[PDB]
Amino acid sequence: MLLHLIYGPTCSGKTDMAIQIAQETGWPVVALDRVQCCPQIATGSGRPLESELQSTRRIYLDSRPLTEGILDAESAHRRLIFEVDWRKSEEGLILEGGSISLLNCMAKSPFWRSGFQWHVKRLRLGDSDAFLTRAKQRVAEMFAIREDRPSLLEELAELWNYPAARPILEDIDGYRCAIRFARKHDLAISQLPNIDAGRHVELIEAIANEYLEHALSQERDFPQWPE
Ligand SMILES: Nc1ncnc2c1ncn2[C@@H]1O[C@H](COP(=O)(O)O)[C@@H](O)[C@H]1O
Ligand SMILES: [Cl-]
């Protein structure tokens, strides 16, 4: 089996690039992401739209309530070995994402050391202002009102109803920013979808900055995968 590993920081187009290989090959893409295993935050965690998937399969390591906590790395790693191992007949698989903790587990693990052919791609953080431009665009996409999927702000207001979800959303990118933006201006979280467009731009900007901060960590704590 051939494993096509695509990894790198947030907003580096890794997802689209995975999808493209998946349409050409017919191979599933397995998301190397813990946060995306909570579908109640599908949009804000970076899950592609069903329309964007272009009929390819994208596999998550678990499907879980946000209030059960984000899947831990060692559990997600064990889950990942499983999704690969039972598909071992298949010609290939695409592993794509940016979970720092799960990539590091992959790098300590004997499983990946033998038994596979490999195509490895690391996307790198480029210049910051190019990064920010792409970050903002992405945030605006997640913010867009659609009749087929909740916005990030909608996902956030829905959960904010459940007190146990509150501590957990405050440790997640986009959400932490959005929560802090609301307190900063004395708005209720429920009220975040209804802000004037002037306040909307301020928030796109702040979330982008929180993405840059995260992409910078990804660059430090990412394992250097051998090519
Ligand atoms: N898809 C994602 N969306 C938002 N935040 C994320 C995502 N993946 C990781 N994070 C953040 O990065 C921190 C470390 O997770 P990880 O990169 O999976 O080890 C998490 O606690 C989240 O705050
Ligand atoms: Cl990406």
Q: What is the CATH number of the domain that holds 44?
A: 3.40.50.300
Distance from Cα 7 to the centre of ligand 2, integer Å: 9
Write out the two tokens for 86. Answer: 């039972």
Distance from Cα 144 to the centre of ligand 1, integer Å: 22
Q: For residues 96 and 116, what is the distance between their CA atoms, to the nearest angstrom? A: 16
Nearest C-alpha neighbor of 37 from the set 46, 24, 49, 28: 46
Write out the two tokens for 12. Answer: 């580096």
Measured CA distances, 121 to 4, 157, 174, 210 (Å): 8, 37, 26, 25
Q: Which atom of ligand 1 is the closest one to the Cα of 103? A: 19
Measured CA distances, 223 to 2, 5, 75, 132 (Å): 20, 13, 19, 24
Which structural domain, as residue segments, surrounds residue 203?
Answer: 125-227
Q: For residues 123 and 13, what is the distance between their CA atoms, to the nearest angstrom? A: 9
In the chain, how many domains are there? 2
Buried b (16+ CB within 10 A) or exposed e, 98-126: bbbebbebbeeeebbeeeeeeeebbbebe
Residues with CB under 6 A from ligand 1: 33-36, 45-46, 99-102, 171-174
Nearest residue CA, atom 2 of ligand 1?
45
Secondary structure of residue 151 in the 3-state scheme: coil
Q: Are residues 150 and 105 in the same domain?
A: no
Q: Are residues 96 and 188 in the same domain?
A: no
- Using alpha carbons only, give the angle 39, 128, 225 rounded to the nearest 5 degrees: 65
Give the domain-ending residue among 94, 124, 154: 124
47: Cβ–Cβ under 8 A, 6 or more apart, which residues?
A: 36, 39
Q: Are residues 3 and 75 in the same domain?
A: yes
Q: Are residues 94 and 133 in the same domain?
A: no
Q: At what angle do helices 100-108 and 73-85 cross, to 10 degrees?
A: 60
Q: Are residues 106 and 144 in the same domain?
A: no
Nearest residue CA, atom 7 of ligand 1?
35
CATH number at residue 156: 1.10.287.890
Identify how the structure was determined. X-ray
Q: Are residues 162 and 210 in the same domain?
A: yes
Give the domain-ending residue among 89, 109, 124: 124
Q: How many CB atoms lie within 10 A of CB 146?
A: 12
Q: Are residues 130 and 113 in the same domain?
A: no
Resolution stated for this PDB structure, in Å:
2.3
Give the domain-ending residue among 87, 104, 124: 124
